[PDB]
Design a protein around this ligand. Structure first.
Ligand SMILES: [Zn+2]
Ligand SMILES: [Zn+2]
Length: 1102
């Protein structure tokens, strides 16, 4: 409802249509001039303009024909997974059945084949075992019509039925063919020549045993052999393959894999049938982790008395597992061991004869491959933390331990490590055995180093997570609860495991006293009882539309990536959640932008109101140029390899049909709200289930609390983005157009704020030059250095006043965008834009809160991030929780996990987390330290105020002399200057120089001045600084000081000469203030466009 135009939005003719009509589902004014038609489909038919709304009307009618067919054959409605699969069947799509076991994947496959048999389409059902072939044929015969022709084949085949199947195979007088997996291998040629409309695979792993079955399956749905080899030639090369546009392949529905999809051949499905064959991911977990500080068998038996059944004890070694087994067998427990008689005691445990099963961490999962038993395992006990250990003896030290020690010492080069035995020679020829251990202790921060036993203990959080997940999974659509108890006595190992679980699984381990056992057991046993009910079905399919690929790639880490569909330009991933299925796809940036030709630089005026016209964005993948106009070739390099957002929008509408509900999860600011509306209004003519999610935190918890505050699109944020965009376009185009006539360069004005900041830099040159005053540095004996005005020839300094007070110095507030850019770029000598890129990187990778923030607010959850870190670090005494601000749409930049940069550094080297460079960790370190200081107690300090006479001038100096109690000292250093006394201090050495009191600008100080003087936004701070560098207006000298170039001075001289009242700071601040009010709904969106046009009208006149 923002009175806009979109150039490819109409759902009927694929052409231009207004924002207002798309929001109401209507096609464009050309297709349907009626504002309120009776039926849109039949209204377009009467006007003889029905073109592509026909596709959606047929899609829904054909889907509901399948739904009626399914409800007539079987007892009841489709499940949430079947609804998604049905809408992909009616579109001819191929996919993996992303769903947990026990949902009815076989039942769907039969109905799909039976439904297509009504239309005359042939299908072929494939099953791993020959028992299932006859079993499926038996169910099919009673579920099929007389006209339906079904023929089977199995190892126990009858003589008369075998020839009937083989004869009808050649005559093509069949509808459904059910045959075994071995059948495909032995009958490779006869199946490849056929073309089936539907292929159902009950078990991929059986089919994927031989690579040649992939070629057979692809040729079974009508993919030519020549295109298969051409696709394999590209995936072997490494890049992705694009299939021919006019290819009509049959449906290939396959089940999820149990084992790993090894090999590069299974990637053929991804490029020809546009779906990924991946194994199911069990990210959906409901576990309460409890830890007991002692490896005591008294509490072990007490826990087993409460649990009573479904316990899976995990010993670390076979020896101590044998010891536990003897103790438990002594207490009349029905306990089974998994080392000698594994099979008998496991199949006893599955039925219910054995209540407690004792396994060994190294080979329980290796033996149990093929049976997960979620209906039996309820409480998982861990006799000791499941950890991998390494010998710290030099002769037995692993390669990764030597890597960090020798790289810190500077002996080994940064590239690939040499032989492990070659690195062992270097360590012996430089380091002693005891020094080798002590270097590990001071560098390896994140693991556990024990000196006496010559052991390096590293908890295996991956193994803990896998063995914990055996107690909680999806049963009958219910994510059942589980309990995981760790009997770890070493606190350092427990703290190491605690932070690794938080990083990977976002789960926490409570202590024995905090756990209420009877409440946990009741939760687990009532959850299993709920699952045992019929429950009917409650699964939905949720689609999350993020804009950044980096965001979607971190969502996949806390959701799973069971499959990946290839949809035009975008990739839509799939995952299994407790609520159903979740899809998530990245938009790859903006979708729409203002055209450059219509009306006033792209904005038209109908009925006196400005209507912005948007055409889809196109990125040239070769030269990077972004353009809006519809072209075949790139306007710069004539390349036809453009990333057209028109296809991205087209894919989103096709996907929107399949999923039940859609949530546009862009960044929680005005920039992300404009993208959210552009997507939302485009999908509204195809789907009414669209809402907005605000993820300030790309995590499980940030995703959860974003959905708790679900809402619709805020048009005030949308209008605010349009006002800023139109101002930059109009001011930029007009001022650049004037500068084009004087200098000849194409793009010379990016807007009003950049010209304001440029004038600051140009006019700072004479401010700094005039401000040169003579100074003299005085070095005092037993005193600090003292800088004072020039020509000091007194040779002595006399103390006149001496005050000693005790302050409690409070810490600095947490980083906002301006604070982060100003301090991090000053400390780590980097441009503000580069710092901004690292900030955006960390936010999208789920390490810090939303970086675009103008508020120091810290949430109660965020305060607990510092408290848990201080409790781990042992300094919980110095925790002073501070909210810092009650106002703010976003809270301050802060680490979302209680993990410091050196701990993150260890995890990256170990391999737990990836994609963080050295500069990522340095920026995160500064963010972590200021945030921890902001939540740390005030440093009780003894201060001194001294009045000192220097050459007859009374100079004041204020200095800290003693720290009475440590606070945020540990995170941000606080220096203590030498104390003064009421004496005469002789001047040791005088240094005469000339220092300018008005300093030159730097990238950090420019950001500081923009915040101070009210111009700029967190979204635009670093961009404004960088554009000046990009267009050659400023440069950085030897000392990293921003100075204006000769070209930049001439350009601003022209601005101050002719158009000063538009560039002046006071007008820029006022308009930035106005646009903030438009975001809050305090100023009128159309009125401020009149305001901008009135100024622009006079800009052309001058
Ligand atoms: Zn139309
Ligand atoms: Zn190009």
């Amino acid at each position: 409802a923002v009175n806009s135009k979109y150039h490819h939005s109409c759902i009927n003719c694929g052409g231009l249509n207004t924002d207002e009509r798309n929001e109401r589902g209507l096609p464009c004014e050309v297709c349907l001039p009626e504002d309120s038609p009776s039926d849109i489909y039949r209204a377009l038919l009467e006007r003889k303009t029905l073109k592509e709304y026909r596709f959606y009307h047929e899609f829904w009618n054909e889907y509901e024909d399948f739904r009626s067919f399914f409800k007539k054959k079987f007892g009841k409605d489709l499940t949430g997974y079947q609804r998604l699969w049905a809408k992909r069947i009616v579109q001819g799509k191929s996919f993996t059945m992303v769903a947990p076991t026990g949902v009815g994947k076989t039942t769907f496959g039969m109905m799909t084949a039976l439904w297509l048999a009504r239309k005359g389409k042939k299908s072929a059902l494939v099953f791993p075992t020959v028992t299932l072939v006859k079993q499926t044929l038996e169910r099919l015969q009673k579920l099929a019509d007389e006209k339906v022709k079904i023929f089977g084949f199995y190892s126990s085949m009858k003589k008369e039925e075998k020839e009937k199947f083989e004869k009808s195979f050649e005559e093509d007088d069949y509808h459904i063919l059910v045959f075994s997996t071995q059948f495909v291998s032995k009958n490779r040629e006869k199946l490849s020549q056929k073309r089936f409309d539907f292929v159902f695979v009950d078990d991929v792993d059986a089919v994927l045993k031989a690579s040649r079955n992939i070629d057979t399956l692809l040729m079974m749905v009508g993919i030519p052999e020549e295109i298969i080899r051409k696709a394999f030639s590209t995936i072997k090369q490494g890049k992705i393959y694009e299939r021919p546009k006019n290819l009509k392949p049959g449906i290939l529905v396959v089940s999820s894999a149990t084992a790993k999809p090894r090999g590069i051949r299974p990637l053929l499905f991804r490029d020809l049938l546009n779906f990924t064959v991946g194994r199911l991911v069990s990210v959906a977990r409901n576990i309460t982790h409890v830890r007991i500080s002692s490896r005591s068998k008294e509490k072990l038996v007490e826990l087993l008395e409460i649990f009573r059944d479904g316990i899976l004890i995990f010993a670390q070694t076979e020896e101590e597992g044998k010891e536990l087994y003897e103790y438990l067998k002594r207490f009349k427990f029905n306990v089974g061991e998994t080392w000698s008689e594994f099979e008998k005691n496991f199949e006893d445990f599955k039925v219910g004869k054995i209540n407690i099963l004792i396994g060994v961490q190294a080979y329980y999962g290796k033996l149990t491959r093929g049976v997960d038993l979620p209906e039996r395992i309820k409480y998982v006990i861990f006799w000791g933390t499941p950890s991998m250990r390494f010998s710290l003896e030099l002769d037995k030290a692993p390669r990764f331990v030597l890597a960090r020690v020798l790289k810190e010492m500077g002996l080994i080069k940064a590239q690939e490590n040499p032989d492990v035995e070659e690195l062992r020679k270097i360590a012996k020829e430089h380091l002693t055995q005891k020094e080798f251990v002590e270097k590990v202790k001071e560098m390896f921060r994140g693991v556990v180093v024990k000196d006496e036993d010559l052991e390096l203990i590293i908890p295996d959080v991956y193994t803990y997570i896998q063995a914990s997940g055996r107690s909680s999974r999806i049963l009958n659509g219910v994510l059942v609860k589980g309990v995981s108890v760790i009997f770890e006595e070493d606190e350092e190992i427990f703290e190491s495991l605690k932070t690794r679980l938080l990083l990977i699984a976002e789960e926490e381990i409570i202590e024995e006293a905090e756990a209420n056992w009877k409440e946990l057991v009741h939760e687990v046993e009532e959850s299993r009882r709920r699952s045992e009910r019929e429950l009917t079905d409650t699964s939905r399919s949720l689609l999350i539309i993020v804009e950044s690929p980096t965001k979607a790639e971190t969502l996949s880490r806390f959701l799973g990536r069971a499959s990946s569909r290839k949809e035009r330009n975008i990739i839509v991933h799939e995952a299994v959640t407790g609520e159903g299925v979740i899809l998530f796809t990245a938009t790859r940036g903006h979708v729409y932008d203002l055209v450059t030709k219509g009306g006033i630089h792209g904005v038209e005026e109908e009925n006196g109101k400005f209507v912005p016209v948007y055409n889809s964005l196109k990125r040239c993948r070769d030269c990077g140029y972004q353009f809006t106009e519809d072209r075949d070739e790139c306007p710069v390099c004539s390349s036809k390899n453009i990333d057209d957002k028109t296809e991205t929008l087209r894919a989103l509408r096709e996907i929107s049909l399949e999923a039940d509900e859609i949530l546009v999860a862009t960044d929680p600011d005005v920039e992300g709200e404009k993208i959210s509306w552009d997507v939302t209004q485009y999908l509204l003519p195809s789907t009414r289930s669209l809402r907005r999610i605000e993820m300030h935190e790309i995590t499980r918890y940030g995703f959860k609390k974003a959905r708790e505050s679900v809402r619709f699109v805020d048009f005030n944020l949308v209008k605010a983005q349009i006002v800023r965009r139109v101002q930059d376009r109009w001011i930029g185009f007009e001022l650049s157009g004037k500068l084009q006539k004087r200098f000849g360069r194409s793009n010379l004005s990016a807007g009003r704020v950049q010209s304001t900041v440029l004038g600051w830099i140009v006019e700072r040159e004479e401010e700094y030059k005039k401000s040169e005053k003579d100074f003299t540095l005085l070095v005092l004996e037993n005193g600090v250095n003292l800088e004072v005005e020039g020509k000091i020839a007194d040779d002595v300094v006399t103390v006149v006043e001496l005050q000693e007070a005790e302050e409690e110095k409070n810490p600095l507030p947490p980083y906002t965008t301006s604070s982060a850019l100003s301090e991090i770029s000053q400390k780590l000598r980097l441009g503000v834009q580069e710092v901004m890129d690292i900030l955006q990187d960390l936010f999208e990778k789920g390490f810090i809160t939303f970086h675009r923030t103008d508020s120091t607010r810290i949430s109660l959850e965020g305060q607990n991030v510092a408290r848990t870190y201080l409790r781990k670090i042992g300094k919980e005494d110095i925790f002073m929780g501070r909210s810092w601000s009650t106002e703010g749409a976003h809270e301050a930049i802060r680490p979302v996990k209680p993990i410091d940069a050196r701990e993150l550094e260890e995890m990256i080297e170990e391999g737990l987390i990836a994609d963080l460079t050295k500069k990522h960790l340095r920026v995160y370190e500064l963010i972590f330290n200021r945030f921890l200081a902001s939540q740390s107690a005030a440093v009780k300090v003894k201060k001194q105020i001294v009045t000192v006479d220097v050459d007859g001038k009374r100079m004041g100096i204020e200095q800290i002399v003693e720290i009475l109690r440590d606070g945020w000292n540990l995170f941000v250093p606080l220096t203590v200057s030498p104390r003064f006394e009421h004496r005469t201090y002789k001047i040791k050495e005088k240094k005469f120089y000339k220092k300018h009191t008005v300093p030159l600008f730097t990238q950090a100080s420019i950001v500081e001045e923009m915040k101070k003087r009210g111009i700029g936004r967190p979204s635009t701070y670093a961009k404004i600084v960088e554009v000046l560098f990009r267009r050659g207006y400023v440069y950085e000298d030897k000392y990293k000081r921003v100075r204006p170039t000769r070209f930049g001075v001439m350009v601003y001289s022209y601005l101050k000469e002719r158009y000063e009242k538009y560039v002046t700071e006071e007008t820029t601040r006022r308009l930035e203030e106005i646009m903030d009010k438009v975001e809050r709904g305090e100023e009128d969106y159309q009125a401020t466009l009149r305001l901008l046009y009135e100024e622009i009208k006079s800009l052309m006149e001058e």
